[PDB]
């Protein structure tokens, strides 16, 4: 009479990527950038004890609530990227010392002008690195003052809280930046000395001892060494680390609340993907990804994939390898990126006025799932099925189908196809309104 097919255990795919990367600043800054740029450029809507910003901006797109936070985070990464580039400048301009000032075979006017030029490039780079480092601190205050005041610095499910060590590095940055601002006259005294040399040793178309200059070269070189290769004492390293810890903190504080999974290919698509997050201590969470993915509405699964991958690299790098000194090549890092997804199912039912699908769980009653009208092909769905399941019928084959998308373990039950030959006013949704029943087909959903 009614014979079901298409049941069974739904396919589960668990995919793990092993990313062999490095802890060098430029690589980490690119990961931080992926996270902040996708957020400030595509503004996804925020999901409607919960935080202060969530009540205010729930259903109200990000960028309206976190526009200042995203701008602060973006500026921190851009300025840290400039710090990394200036530390490259700084490493390329290391002035050498004067050996035997009395001898002028080697201590030539061309050599001293070349010495003064480097002192000039080196001093100017130091000034720019420090300027940028103070601006990252300024941009951090802008980030830590708004909605995320109570959250970004705090940590104790860890979602909603910073958990990035942003407070510890702000303090080390303030102390490092202070010491470097104390040594400003000494880098001024080397800068004017270099400007007097380029001038004096220069051509005159109209016709400050060696130790003192060696003092200036030694001071510049020692300061530059700590600025480029230092950690605890470098405001360059602390500013770049604060930028990295702030983006990680930004994602931990509000990333869970971002709407993801908007349709790219076509509306109502089995794209649903679970993104796995692991905290230290092994506390694992998973974020799941019906509307079009577009700016100010949603994030496509590809967009979330790229944030999730950047986050895993950034997290592992910051948590377990640390940031490598700005002038060092950087050590290897192995990051793990895990995602999972369930397959779809298509129940079929061959018969030989209305046809429906029912589900019954162990010990629980027969619940209506979906129904279809025999001539018109009008369909009705139970609230559980609505949007996920689709009922259809092949008039010719006298078959009814149930496309099952967006499956979750809760859907595990025996699925029955049912038929009513007699007429009706109100669409039949109760089991007593159906006269013919199929054998039943077990459908099993479970996480790996
Ligand atoms: Cl009836």
How far apart CA 11 and CA 428 sit, in angstroms, is 32
User: What is the 358 CA–ligand 1 centroid distance (Å)?
Assistant: 17
Cα dihedral 322→328→331→337 (10° resolution): 60
Sign of the Cα torsion 129, 39, 46, 272 reads negative
Q: Please tell me the distance between residue 438's alpha carbon and the centre of ligand 1 in angstroms.
A: 20
CA 357 – ligand 1 centroid, Å: 17
The alpha carbon of 350 and the centre of ligand 1 are apart by a number of angstroms equal to 24
User: Which own/partner pairs from 404-409 qualify as long-range (CB within 8 Å, at least 24 positions apart)?
Assistant: 404/10, 404/344, 404/345, 404/346, 404/347, 404/443, 405/268, 405/269, 405/270, 405/272, 405/344, 406/270, 406/272, 407/10, 407/342, 407/343, 407/344, 407/345, 407/445, 408/342, 408/445, 409/445, 409/446, 409/447
Question: 371 is written with which tokens?
Answer: 């129904």
**Ligand 1 midpoint to CA 4 (Å):** 25
Number of Cβ atoms within 10 Å of the Cβ of 383: 6
Identify the CA nearest to 274 among candidates 338, 321, 205, 186: 338
Identify the experimental approach.
X-ray
- The CA distance from 132 to 400, in Å, is 66
Contact yes or no for 300/293 (Cβ under 8 A): yes
Strands 332-342 vs 12-22: parallel, antiparallel or unpaired:
antiparallel
Q: Give distance in angstroms: CA of 367 to centre of ligand 1.
A: 17
The values of phi and psi at residue 331, to 5°, are: -95, 160
Q: How far, in Å, from the CA of 64 to the mean position of ligand 1?
A: 53
What CA–CA distance (Å, rounded) separates 104 from 107? 4
CA of 392 to the centre of ligand 1 (A): 23
Query: Are 303 and 37 a contacting pair, CB within 8 Å?
Result: no
**Rg of the chain's alpha carbons, rounded to an integer?**
32
Strand-pairing partners, residue 5, are: 348
Checking the chain for breaks where C and the next N are over 2.5 Å apart, the residues before them are: 48, 156, 207, 289, 352
- C-alpha of residue 433 to centroid of ligand 1, in Å: 5
CA of 423 to the centre of ligand 1 (A): 9
Burial tier of 375 (Cβ tally within 10 Å: 0-12, 13-18, 19+): exposed
Counted residue by residue, the chain has a size of 448
Ramachandran quadrant class, 401 (left: phi over 0; alpha: psi -120 to 50; beta: rest) = beta
Burial class of residue 256, CB neighbours in 10 A (0-12, 13-18, 19+): middle
CA of 255 to the centre of ligand 1 (A): 51
Ligand 1 centroid from CA 424, angstroms = 7
Rounded Cα gap, residues 91 and 428, in angstroms: 79
Q: How far is the CA of 418 from the centre of ligand 1 (A)?
A: 14
Contacts of 2 (CB under 8 A, 6+ apart): 349, 350, 351, 417, 418, 419, 436, 437, 438, 439
Q: How far, in Å, is the centroid of ligand 1 from the Cα of 419?
A: 13
Q: How far is the CA of 420 from the centre of ligand 1 (A)?
A: 10
Q: Give the tokens for residue 330.
A: 């950087």
Distance 422 CA to ligand 1 centre (A): 9
Q: State in Å: Cα 431 to ligand 1 middle.
A: 10
Rounded distance from Cα 376 to ligand 1 centre (Å): 20
Are the C-beta atoms of 235 and 130 separated by less than 8 Å? Answer: yes
Q: How far apart are CA 433 and CA 448, in angstroms?
A: 38
Could you give the angle at the alpha carbon of 276 between the alpha carbons of 270 and 279, nearest 5°?
A: 160
Distance 354 CA to ligand 1 centre (A): 12
How is residue 387 written in tokens?
């949007």
State the distance from the centre of ligand 1 to the C-alpha of 174, rounded, in angstroms. Answer: 78
- For 215, phi then psi, to 5°, come to -70, -45
Going from N- to C-terminal start, the domains of the chain cover: 2-10+344-444, 24-330
Query: In whole angstroms, what is the distance from residue 46 CA to residue 109 CA?
Result: 65
Question: 430: CA distance to ligand 1 center in Å?
Answer: 9
In whole angstroms, give the CA distance from residue 40 to residue 49: 27
Three state DSSP letters for the chain: CEEEECCEECCEEEEEEEEEEECCHHHHHHHHHHHHHHHHHHCCEECCCCCHHHHHHCCCECCCCCHHHHHHHHHHHHHHHHHHHHHHHHHHCCCCCCCCCCCCCCCCHHHHHHHHHHHHHHHHHHHHHHHHHHHHHHHHHHHHHCCCCCCCCCCCCCCCCCCCCHHHHHHHHHHHHHHHHHCHHHHHCCHHHHHHHHHHCCCCCCCCCHHHHHHHHHHHHHHHHHHHHCCCCCHHHHHHHHHHHHHHHHHHHHHHHECECCECCCCCCCCCCEEEEECHHHCEEEEECCCECCCCCCECHHHHHHHHHHHHHHHHHHHHHCCCCCCCCCCEEEEEEEEEEECCEEEEEEECCEEEEEEECCCCCCEEEEEEECCCCCEEECCCCCCCEEEEEECCCCEEEEEECCCCHHHCEEEEEEEECCCCCCCCCCHHHCCEECCCEEEECCCC
In angstroms, what CA-CA distances link 180 with 3, 120, 223, 233? 81, 18, 8, 9
Give the distance (Å) from ligand 1 centre to CA of residue 426: 9
- Within 10 angstroms of residue 332's Cβ, the number of other Cβ atoms is 9
Distance CA 136, CA 235 (A): 10
Exposed e or buried b per residue across 62-85, where buried means at least 16 C-beta atoms within 10 angstroms of its C-beta:
bbebbeebbbbbbbbbbbbbbbbe
Maximum distance among all Cα pairs of the chain, rounded to whole angstroms: 118
Superfamily classification of domain 2-10+344-444: Immunoglobulins (2.60.40.10)
The CA distance from 190 to 193, in Å, is 5
Is residue 301 within 8 A of residue 260, CB to CB? The reply is yes
Q: Which residues contact 50 (CB under 8 A, 6 or more apart)?
A: none
Note the Cα 400 to chain centre separation in Å: 44
Using the mean position of ligand 1's atoms as its centre, give its distance from the Cα of residue 380 in Å: 17
Instruction: Give just the sign of the alpha carbon dihedral 249, 254, 256, 260.
Output: negative
């Amino acid at each position: 009479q009614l014979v079901e097919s298409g049941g069974g255990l739904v396919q589960t795919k668990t995919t793990t990527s092993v990313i062999d990367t490095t802890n060098d600043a430029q690589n980490l800054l690119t990961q931080a950038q992926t996270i902040v740029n996708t957020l400030k450029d595509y503004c996804p809507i925020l999901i409607a004890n919960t935080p202060s910003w969530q009540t205010a901006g729930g259903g109200k797109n990000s960028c309206a609530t976190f526009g200042a936070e995203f701008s602060a985070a973006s500026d921190m990464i851009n300025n840290a990227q400039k710090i990394v580039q200036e530390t490259q400048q700084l490493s390329a301009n290391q002035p050498k010392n004067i050996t035997q000032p009395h001898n002028l075979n080697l201590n030539s006017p061309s050599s001293l002008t070349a010495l003064a030029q480097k002192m000039l490039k080196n001093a100017q780079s130091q000034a720019e690195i420090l300027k940028l480092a103070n601006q990252v601190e300024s941009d951090f205050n802008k980030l830590s003052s708004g909605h995320l005041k109570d959250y970004i610095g705090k940590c104790d499910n860890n979602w909603g809280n910073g958990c990035a060590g942003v407070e510890e590095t702000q303090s080390l940055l303030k102390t490092s930046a202070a010491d470097f601002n104390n040594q400003t006259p000494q880098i001024n005294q080397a800068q004017n000395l270099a400007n007097t040399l380029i001038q004096e040793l220069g051509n005159n178309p109209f016709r400050t001892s060696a130790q003192a200059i060696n003092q200036a070269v030694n001071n510049l070189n020692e300061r530059a060494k700590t600025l480029a290769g230092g950690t605890t004492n470098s405001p360059a390293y602390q500013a770049t680390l604060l930028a990295l810890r702030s983006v990680l903190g930004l994602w931990n504080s509000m990333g869970y609340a971002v709407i993801c999974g908007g349709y790219t290919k076509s509306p109502g698509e089995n794209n649903q993907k679970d993104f796995h997050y692991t905290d230290e201590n092994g506390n694992g969470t998973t974020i799941n990804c019906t509307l079009k993915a577009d700016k100010n509405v949603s994030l496509s699964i590809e967009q979330y994939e790229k944030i999730h991958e950047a986050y895993q690299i950034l997290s592992k790098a910051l948590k377990q390898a640390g940031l490598a000194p700005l002038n060092s090549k950087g050590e290897k890092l192995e990051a793990h990126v895990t995602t999972s997804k369930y397959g779809s199912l298509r129940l079929s039912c061959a018969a030989s006025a209305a046809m429906g699908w029912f589900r019954q769980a162990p010990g629980k009653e027969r619940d209506f799932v979906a129904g279809i009208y025999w001539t018109v092909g009008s369909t009705y769905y139970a609230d559980s099925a609505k949007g996920r399941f689709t009922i259809s019928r092949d008039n010719a084959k006298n078959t009814v189908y149930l496309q099952m998308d967006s499956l979750k373990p809760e859907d595990t039950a025996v699925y029955y196809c049912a038929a009513r030959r007699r007429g009706f006013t109100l669409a039949p949704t109760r089991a007593n309104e159906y006269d013919y029943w199929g054998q039943g087909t077990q459908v099993t959903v479970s996480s790996h």
